Amino acid sequence: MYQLEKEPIVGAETFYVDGAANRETKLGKAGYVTNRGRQKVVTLTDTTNQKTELQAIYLALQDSGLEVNIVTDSQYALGIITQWIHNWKKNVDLVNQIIEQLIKKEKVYLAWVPAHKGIGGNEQVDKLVSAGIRKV
Ligand SMILES: O=c1[nH]c2ccc(S(=O)(=O)c3ccccc3)cc2c(=O)n1O
Ligand SMILES: [Mn+2]
Ligand SMILES: [Mn+2]
């Protein structure tokens, strides 16, 4: 990939990603739902909210084709990726794994939306990852 796309990629699968963690137990979940009806959730241990957001993006990169749209509610995760591309043109291992996957893509669009603002795909993945982690 040459850059993050300036707008969504026509014809590419869209992954709504999210993570949830609990500070008392360090238990969490990460996952995605896609516009093509795919979904995945994984359970995590010794994790944090920010780590789960990175894990969700890693899953989306791993499971997507060469062109992908990713919608996250994490400014932290968005910033990690934007900063790396910049320097190219905390959570060190996870970040390296994400960059490893990112560089294999042909095109990537990555957009931020606010959490808990009624945004469809984002609310769907939030329900999936927060169950058993965050109290309703
Ligand atoms: O990235 C984030 N940031 C959040 C910030 C606040 C809340 S909250 O629990 O305080 C909340 C819940 C419901 C409505 C408003 C705020 C939840 C989240 C969340 O689930 N994800 O994924
Ligand atoms: Mn989130
Ligand atoms: Mn959430």
Determine contact, residues 30/59, Cβ cutoff 8 Å.
Answer: yes
User: At what resolution in Å was this solved?
Assistant: 1.4
Level-2 CATH architecture, domain 1-136:
2-Layer Sandwich (3.30)
41 touches 60 (CB < 8 A): no
Q: What is the 3-state secondary structure of 109-129?
A: EEEECCCCCCCHHHHHHHHHH
Query: What is the spatial distance between Cα 91 and Cα 116, in angstroms, rounded to a whole number?
Result: 25
Tokens of 51: 């780590």
**Among the listed residues 101, 22, 99, the one whose alpha carbon sits nearest the alpha carbon of residue 66:** 101
CA distances from 133 to 24, 36, 126 (A): 10, 26, 11
| Burial class (CB within 10 angstroms; exposed 0-12, middle 13-18, buried 19+) of 71 | buried
**Annotation-wise, does 106 bind a ligand?**
no
- What span, in angstroms and rounded, lies between the C-alpha atoms of 43 and 45? 7
Q: Is 115 in the pocket of ligand 1 (CB under 6 A)?
A: yes
How far is 118 from 11, CA to CA, in rounded Å?
A: 25
Check pocket membership of 113 for ligand 1, CB cut-off 6 A: no
Closest CA to 75 of 29, 102, 113, 103: 113
Contact indicator for 56, 129 with CB cutoff of 8 Å: yes
49 CA from centroid of ligand 1 (Å): 10
**Residue 57 corresponds to which tokens in the numbers above?**
């993006």
Structure tokens that stand for 99 in this block: 């960059």
At position 79, the amino acid (one-letter code) is G
Q: Give the tokens for residue 53.
A: 């957001």
